[PDB]
Amino acid sequence: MAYGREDVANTRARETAARFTAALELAIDRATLSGQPVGIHFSDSAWRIMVPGKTPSAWRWVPLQEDAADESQNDWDEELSIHLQPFKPDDSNQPQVVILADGQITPFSLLMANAGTGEPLLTLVCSGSWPLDQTLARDTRP
């Protein structure tokens, strides 16, 4: 059984994954320049890339919107709700994902659900390095 209202959200999920993959390429390109690993905050209703501040020599964080203002966050969709693991969608003082200058990525999985029905359309999976692996609903993500 299904709501019969998934095709628009499934298209927006596939788009949101392409937009995220480009934003994660941006994060890898920024990490070699920043002198500290880059990260990505996640909170379901929004997300954003993040960078060091005051010093590169110690763990610190600032939202990456010095020019990516409202392009780093929320604008990528009009049909989705976002979830992840082993971290959680939460308004933390730090990012929920982290990226090295070499393109190594902290393991996680990120899932997308249709905001009109609650049904999953797509999931993305990370196992140590760029890029994430896309799947329909949860087909590769137990």
Q: What tokens does 140 get? A: 């590769």
Within 10 angstroms of residue 12's Cβ, the number of other Cβ atoms is: 21
Structural domains of the chain in order of their starting residue, each with its CATH number: 6-137 (3.55.40.10)
What CA–CA distance (Å, rounded) separates 135 from 75?
Answer: 22
Residues paired with 47 in a beta bridge: 42
Record the tokens describing residue 49, joined without a space: 């890339």
Cβ atoms within 10 Å, residue 72? 23
Owner of token pair 């982290």: 98
CA distances (Å), origin 85, targets 6, 55, 108: 23, 29, 6
Q: Contact 31/50 with Cβ under 8 angstroms?
A: no
